[PDB]
Amino acid sequence: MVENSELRKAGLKVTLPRVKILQMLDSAQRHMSAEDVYKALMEAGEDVGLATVYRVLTQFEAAGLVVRHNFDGGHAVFELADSGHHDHMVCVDTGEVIEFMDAEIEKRQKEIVRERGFELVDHNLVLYVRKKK
């Protein structure tokens, strides 16, 4: 299965809890907390406890299958890494998260780093915003 390959490529043994959580992440909320995953699983009548959900998502994060972000300061969001790249705009007053991808900034980041003798390994860009209105 595709999930099995993803887990193996990530140096992680294939297990039922690991497969169900990855499937939950695949189907979307784009930015889910550990509780959102747990609640979705419980709705689906599954049998995975919250602590296990958090543990697995942390295993996925360390492995590179997911990225963990904290946009409102008070909770962690976990989202797949495999998906197309996206940086984020966060509405400070409401907590609304808006993904974006600007090719100009992406190429400028590469230029900045390369002209210094480096290679860009990863990056994080968050723009905190408020409606002009």
Which residues of this protein are in contact with Zn ion, per CB under 5 A? Answer: 72, 74-75, 79, 86-87, 99, 104, 108
104 near its own copies (CB under 8 A) = yes
Nearest CA to 76 out of 20, 28, 126, 31 is that of 31
Residue 79 known to bind ligand: yes
Indicate which of Zn ion, its own copies, none lies near residue 75 (CB less than 5 to 8 Å, by partner kind).
Zn ion
Collapsing DSSP to helix, strand or coil, 77 comes out as strand
Residue 87 known to bind ligand: yes
Q: Name the amino acid, one letter, at 109.
A: Q
The least CB distance from residue 55 to its own copies, in Å, is: 21
φ/ψ of 107, rounded to 5, equals: -75, -35
Binders of its own copies among 30-59, rule CB under 8 A? none
Indicate which of Zn ion, its own copies, none lies near residue 111 (CB less than 5 to 8 Å, by partner kind).
its own copies
Collapsing DSSP to helix, strand or coil, 106 comes out as helix
9 near its own copies (CB under 8 A) = no
Residue 86 known to bind ligand: no
Among positive and negative, which fits the CA dihedral 38, 39, 44, 46?
Answer: positive
86 near its own copies (CB under 8 A) = yes
109: left (phi over 0), alpha (psi -120 to 50) or beta: alpha
Give me the residues paired with residue 89 across strands.
98, 127
Q: Which residues line the annotated binding site for Fe cation?
A: 85, 87, 106, 123
- Which residues bind to its own copies, rule: CB under 8 A? 1-3, 25-28, 80, 82-86, 101-104, 106-107, 110-111, 114
